[PDB]
Design a protein around this ligand. Structure first.
Ligand SMILES: CCCCCCCCCCCCCC(=O)OC[C@H](COP(=O)(O)OCCN)OC(=O)CCCCCCCCCCCCC
Ligand SMILES: CCCCCCCCCCCCCC(=O)OC[C@H](COP(=O)(O)OCCN)OC(=O)CCCCCCCCCCCCC
Lengths: 956, 956
């Protein structure tokens, strides 16, 4: 006969499925239908003489479940998913408010509801039974409210508040119930006794949870490439922790399971694989679904059993059916009182709480399966021979808690969306409409591209038209007046597009991307009145390391001192770096889109002024801990490489070109590398002087000979912020090889109207064009941050130009880069180093013309007169720093616009030119994903070795 | 006290984890360590007076498990994963051999081993107990052998044979055990009775399995976007089916669970989501892992309990410890005899079986958890008050089966790799080394590209060198003499690269890709002696539809007649289409790589002769069922679009730009579309005549006016294979607008030396250049398959050219496409329609020169003299079909090589040209993933509307 038990479980699941399939889209949850079906099954089995057969025998086997086994089997499953799948950052920033709703809230609710049950209900309960039942009804449901918020559509702050309030409240309400239930059994009490009991239970639960989490994370760290082992470890450790807490030490078990779930959620990236992240969550969601369905089917059956057994709780008199509604009203009043009493505190702590998101927090008081489990446990413990707990009192408890569980879900849970819509919320911001429409546009473009690519076929013929194929896909079924308000939104849209691109290209993880996107989203609401403010959200993540107090303090192993400083500074450095990249890209895109307009310039100035705090924190990390940034960048590049290789290996397995052994070996190696990286990330040594000089394109690409001379008598120098390298006008006495840092260039005669970032990064050569032409410097360069630089005097460069006829052309190709980034900043500033180097050294043509020849720029060619005096009628003398444009070229398209704001005399538009001295000209030819969000509605050879050294660290 | 039970489970899992973590890499499995730990726990609990506490109490609770509950709980979990995760195509093509090892094999083993136990063992067993124990030892383990093959590295044929033999054998050996066990209880028997029992059990099991599978697939079909529901449905249905079979109808339960698993594996794509495919498998692997660990821990405990209880099976006398080895020898001899008796049959049925892969099939006789479960069930059924089965006999059975389970895994399972290496197998083919090295090269390239892209940073500085970052990633740690043998391998490598590209670009699913890759792999072994033979593997998949007999037969609903014909022809049409695309791409790539060489030409001819069977089956589908190909192509394009949109939506969720409600809606719509497509794929109507004419680029891009004239008096014509459109030399009387089909062009004076496919697909215009120049046709075009074509007489085209000055240039741009695909086939034949159209209509320059002007081809420009008589010294007269090359151009790089094999007189290399009549010239400028596998070691305006109509079905 025990086999029938299995049947029950099976059958229950089926019912669950049905209830979760038909009652979808409708607002009433399916757990109410589950409870009704359970009551029906229990009544059929226990009331009718024939009842059921081979299934009723499986219901009875379950209706007599042990009071302790029930909890030990069903509570860890119910709680581990809710505790494990929760954002740590959000609650950590909101943890102040949740402490007020967890401790004081549960205390107030428990004592009110229980004091009301003692003074009103007629069952002659003493002051322990009533407050026992009051401790039950103070336990929310982390799954019911999770589903409600899934189908609700409220702001994220309120969602996080409710989702945490419920889980933290569940830990506290279970503790109080444990206390009052132990007291109901007969044990005496006292102030000291109550204090010791509460302290022991509460704190030992968390201690055991943290111990088990630490021991099982330390173990998981060494499990390379096997997901079944990790899932089984989580399961076994959760259940062992619950058994050890609730049944070995006599501490709270729900608290231990919650602490374990949270300790796992905090260390998910470090311990579990990246591909086993969606399988783990799905396994635990399946476990939690089974647990809820089984408990809701079981609780109905047990309620029906008790009712039919005693017969004093149904049709005996309307007393019970009225006192149930009275208890519901009391629960509502208790929640209202808790909220109204903690409002003066919940208003200005963590997140705000105005009348709206406080009237929506009082309604979402859904009861779930934890209260039902506790009621079933109490009823089962009473069904035995217990002088203290009578059987009628146990079924009085199974009846009231299940009755309150049904009325709360049908009324509060169904009318939580109607109320949220009535209050005024649930309306799109009208600034997310643009993002939605742009995403729909980008989806339509992807679909069009795929269709167009897959159309040519000689065998299967052509497909149907594009419209006939779009009618099937319903994912695409339906979709200068500029004020200071809209441009501040276009800039934030550009920032969002930059964040999107950075995460897609692998430059930032998904956690950092989510943090930055949340910051931008919370900032796009204050733009209608306040200036651009995106730095608020990240200011709490960019706290200068509190570790710095302790690096000043002495810790014995430098592994600990270097390891912990690179782990408190790791998130802030990445966030400020990404904030300052996204903002620099957004400024450039906005300048390109809205041209030069007074409002666009003011918004750009707002962004420039906003970036100052991040710039200063980055400057402070560079001087206080010099080796942190290099380690962080190396880790970033290594993680990007590993992610790309992982994506490539996963695509190879689908095809079947490689056998099981070889691909299993490939995958094993890749996963071992990924886990060894995420567990003990590598630390990069410091770079030697003579090493940096060899990674610099100019000095690195030179031959072994004629290089010992340049490197000898070259001393690296570390210059601080604001130091002047060379002033404009002074004679050309050097070239400064910037290998680490940034240098900002300023000029008095060069257009600084279209230059939004006059900075030259590492691997650059400053002052070479000027030492080649032998003339005074054309700009005043000043360091922008800490810069490691080398200075080679002019003589050495002259000797090197005199050495080989091919190290004269190399020097010129290397100086043309800086000359073109300086003269024409509107074209050659948005370009990356690789692209500009390719276009200026490979696809650009450097010609030398003898005296007398004629130069006629074809309409498509712009040219920079690198060297030599060129002549033209009425304009005989022309200085070498110079730009030759097509006679009819539109300046406004290249900058150079001669205006009162910026004077331009280094550009020439003439019919033809005639060489006056031996000239050297450079001719260049003229006429990225998600960047359209901003303005959507309106729209070998030395050169190859240098390019290698500039792309990769060393020549390959 | 029941709570302790939970502990046991938990603890067991931990042990499992440990045993599965330490005993990795080593050859001895971990289940033996599991059994040893279980024996240790059982001996500690039952032998010592103190034993254990709060855990031993949980062991006893388990050691007294019900004999039926044990099976009902543990067998479905053990069997559903093995039955569900199995290739259907492989076993279906090998199912002949598995029937011989399943029925006759189990019968022979059972009767031998059981006849030997009766004649040798001294326990005075009767002829039912001995053959009961003999029915146990005939049940293999689908999980032990699965893991063994995972860690073995043998061919795929032997792997599939063993993996199926074990699962099919498990279904048959359980049936026999059920029979003999029911007989041991006391029931009488007879020939008729035995026959009825066997038939009822065996067939009713499969019937119930198929019924449950059908009912649960029909249900799953309507579950849109929820994975938990699908996993819970599989679980609940599996357990309900097992309970209904084993405990309600008295039929075999393992057979029902196996039938259900197979019915699910056959309908995995149609019922389950694409993202819930890795979570379902992982959930069921977790269930199976728990089941194995629990059973192996439980069986050890029960063996120890029985031994310590009776004390006649350990140290009573060496009789037991010797008869155990004797029974092991008997099992080995029984397997050897089965194989030696079925060899004459297993040799030439399905897959072959030579001495090697038959000596490796005799060694892989691992016993697992099914035999242990049956032994535990028998011992438990005996432990009760049973006059038939004594307790000593039950523990004699738990001891022997567990003892045989341990000796088989330690000896056979550990020395199955040593034997496979000794026999000679386990050596790479030396033709997979090239693919492995090329994959390593492509991984290194991806890593280099990612590193180079992620290097420029103004904030975080530069990373370390490339070598310092590659030292961390260990996935990259380590890596004209041409005969008819190697070129036949390069062609197959090109075919493999084409298959890889087609699956990546979404043109074929993963099942078709695996089929084709398996065919190519099995074919690359016969090339050393036999010609190119890839069509063998697919000839069994390309069977002309057996449905055609039934389309001749009358089925009442055309939904059924059209639906079933598009489902028997669906896989063969896709396979032949992909075979003929991959082979056409491989031929082209090989001709490009090895130039014109006698061996390369012979290999190309071999491939051309091999493609004939697929070409003919495709021709037969086009005439017998005309609307099938259009429906298949529309489904292909729609599935590619949906896959691309799904990938795009999954990437959007990671960023957090869109709220929970909007993305949940997007994902819901996408998943609903995907499931409605995979469940009821759409059928495309037939194309109307006046519709096709409007999708043709030339006639479609014309304005509404001057189009009514062309379309009027135009009658579509369907011409069959080999029909002649127009012969070379005849006066130009028409233009044929090919909109569906293919036309092959042949010439007598045009080079057919570098043209590997002279075919023009749909949406092409033939005979327009000739009606424009008013001269005889320049090639003889003949249909290549069934072709739907329209004929507009010459007058109409002349009227249309006279109509507008901009519909003269459009006609010329449209004729230049065919002229350039015809004259210079080495450049303009590998190009897709989109690329060639862009390059010839947008990036190519058509100029008209007046009489007398001079033409000087710049060194980088090739030019086609579309119209007019051009002159040059000593070469006054030059006909318009003509090609002008740079005076120093290398013909061998463009074809045109004047040689005895192919004569060329339409190409001219001269210093300069002088117009003799008003000339019209066209100038073109001169100087893809995984295609390097072959030769790896050695290396608006009318035009825009036409391009739109050619890319997408209609103008957008
Ligand atoms: C969702 C994840 C759950 C993980 C489960 C962890 C392992 C569970 C271990 C099962 C323990 C078995 C309990 C047992 O031995 O049955 C005894 C119990 C009745 O015990 P008695 O009433 O005789 O106790 C005497 C005083 N009351 O039996 C009864 O009469 C009631 C039957 C209780 C069945 C409990 C089964 C566990 C839930 C199974 C669902 C799993 C779904 C995958
Ligand atoms: C891996 C997927 C498994 C899916 C499980 C499906 C639901 C399982 C339903 C559990 C049924 C509970 C059985 C029960 O009521 O306990 C009784 C049994 C002992 O029964 P008695 O010996 O008293 O029977 C009288 C005559 N022999 O109890 C005992 O003394 C032995 C204890 C048996 C425990 C069985 C628990 C199931 C396995 C739990 C593991 C799940 C892991 C997630």
């Amino acid at each position: 006969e025990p086999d029938d038990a299995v049947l029950f479980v099976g059958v229950s699941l089926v019912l669950g499925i049905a209830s979760r399939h038909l009652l979808r889209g409708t607002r009433v949850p399916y757990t109410v239908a589950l409870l009704v079906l359970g009551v029906a099954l229990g009544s059929l089995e226990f009331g009718t003489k024939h009842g059921m057969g081979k299934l009723g025998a499986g219901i009875r086997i379950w209706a007599n479940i042990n009071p302790d086994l029930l909890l030990a089997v069903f509570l860890p499953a119910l709680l581990f998913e809710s505790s494990f799948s929760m954002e740590i950052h959000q609650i950590k920033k909101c943890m102040a408010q949740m402490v007020l709703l967890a401790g004081p809230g549960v205390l107030i609710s428990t004592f009110f509801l229980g004091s009301a049950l003692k003074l009103t209900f007629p069952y002659n309960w003493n002051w322990k039974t009533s407050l026992l039942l009051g401790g039950l009804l103070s336990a929310t449901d982390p799954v019911a409210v999770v589903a409600l918020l899934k189908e609700l559509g409220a702001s994220k702050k309120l969602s996080t508040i409710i989702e945490g309030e419920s889980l933290m409240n569940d830990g506290t309400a279970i503790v109080v119930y444990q206390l009052f239930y132990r007291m109901v059994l007969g044990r005496t009490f006292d102030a000291g006794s109550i204090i010791k009991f509460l302290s022991e239970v509460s704190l030992g639960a968390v201690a055991l949870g943290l111990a088990f989490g630490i021991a099982s994370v330390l173990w998981l760290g060494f499990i390379f490439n096997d997901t079944i082992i990790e899932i089984a470890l989580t399961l076994a450790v959760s259940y062992i922790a619950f058994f050890t807490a609730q049944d070995a030490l006599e501490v709270s078990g729900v608290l231990t399971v919650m602490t374990l779930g949270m300790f796992y959620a905090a260390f998910a990236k470090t311990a579990f694989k990246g591909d086993s992240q969606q399988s783990l969550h799905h396994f635990w969601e399946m476990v939690a679904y089974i647990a809820n369905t089984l408990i809701f089917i079981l609780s109905g059956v047990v309620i029906a059993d008790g009712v039919l057994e005693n017969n004093v709780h149904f049709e005996r008199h309307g007393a019970s059916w009225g006192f149930l509604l009275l208890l519901y009203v009391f629960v509502q009043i208790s929640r209202i009182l808790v909220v109204v009493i903690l409002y003066p505190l919940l208003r200005h702590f963590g997140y705000g709480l105005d009348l709206k998101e406080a009237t929506i927090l009082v309604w979402a008081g859904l009861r779930g399966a934890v209260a039902l489990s506790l009621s079933l446990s109490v009823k089962r413990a009473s069904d035995a021979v217990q002088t203290h707990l009578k059987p009628v009192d146990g079924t009085m408890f199974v009846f009231f808690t299940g009755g309150i569980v049904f009325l709360t879900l049908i009324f509060n849970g169904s009318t939580t969306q109607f109320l949220l819509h009535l209050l005024g919320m649930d309306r799109l911001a009208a600034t997310k409409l643009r993002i939605l429409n742009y995403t729909k546009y980008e989806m339509l473009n992807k679909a069009l591209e795929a269709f167009g690519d897959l159309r040519d076929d000689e065998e299967l013929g052509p497909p149907a038209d594009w419209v006939t194929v779009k009618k099937y896909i319903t994912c695409l079924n339906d979709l200068h007046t500029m004020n200071l308000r809209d441009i501040r939104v276009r800039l934030l849209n550009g920032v969002q597009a930059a964040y999107w691109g950075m995460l897609e290209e692998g430059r930032i993880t998904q956690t950092t991307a989510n943090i930055l996107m949340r910051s931008v989203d919370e900032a796009m609401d204050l733009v209608p009145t306040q200036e651009l403010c995106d730095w608020k959200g990240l200011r709490s993540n960019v706290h200068f390391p509190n570790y710095y107090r302790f690096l000043q303090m002495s810790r014995l192993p430098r592994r600990l001192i270097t390891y912990f400083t690179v782990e408190r500074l790791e998130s802030g450095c990445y966030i400020c770096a990404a904030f300052l990249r996204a903002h620099r890209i957004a400024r450039r895109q906005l300048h390109d889109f809205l041209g030069d307009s007074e409002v666009a310039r003011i918004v750009i100035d707002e962004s420039n002024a906003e970036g100052e705090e991040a710039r200063k924190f980055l400057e402070d990390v560079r001087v206080t801990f010099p080796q942190v940034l290099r380690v962080l960048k190396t880790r970033q590049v290594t993680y990007s490489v590993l992610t790309h290789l992982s994506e490539y290996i996963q695509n190879l397995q689908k095809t079947g070109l490689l056998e099981e052994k070889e691909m299993a070996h490939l995958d094993d190696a890749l996963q071992t590398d990924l886990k060894k990286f995420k567990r003990n990330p590598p630390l990069v040594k410091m770079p030697r002087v003579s090493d940096l000089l060899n990674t610099h394109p100019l000095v690195g690409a030179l031959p072994a000979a004629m290089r010992d001379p340049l490197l000898s008598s070259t001393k690296e120098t570390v210059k601080g912020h604001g130091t002047i390298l060379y002033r404009e006008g002074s004679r050309p006495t050097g070239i400064w090889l910037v290998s680490i840092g940034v240098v900002k260039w300023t000029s008095q005669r060069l257009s600084s109207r279209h230059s939004l970032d006059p900075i030259l990064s590492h691997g650059s050569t400053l002052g070479l064009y000027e030492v080649l032409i032998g003339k005074p410097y054309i700009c005043d360069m000043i360091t922008d941050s800490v810069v490691h630089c080398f200075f080679i005097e002019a003589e050495k460069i002259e000797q090197l130009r005199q050495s080989d006829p091919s190290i004269e052309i190399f020097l010129w190709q290397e100086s043309a880069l800086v000359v073109a980034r300086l003269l024409l900043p509107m074209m050659f500033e948005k370009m990356a180093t690789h692209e500009l180097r390719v276009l200026i050294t490979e696809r650009s043509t450097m010609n030398i013309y003898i005296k007398g020849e004629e130069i006629e720029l074809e309409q498509n060619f712009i040219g920079i007169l690198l060297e030599g005096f060129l002549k033209t009628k009425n304009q005989t003398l022309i200085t070498p720093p110079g730009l030759l444009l097509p006679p009819n070229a539109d300046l406004n398209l290249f900058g150079l616009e001669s205006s009162a704001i910026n004077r331009i005399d280094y550009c020439y538009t003439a019919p033809s030119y005639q060489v006056e001295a031996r000239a050297r000209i450079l001719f260049v030819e003229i006429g990225k994903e998600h960047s359209g969000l901003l303005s959507w509605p309106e729209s070998a050879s030395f050169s190859a070795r240098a390019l290698q050294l500039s792309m990769y660290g060393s020549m390959i």
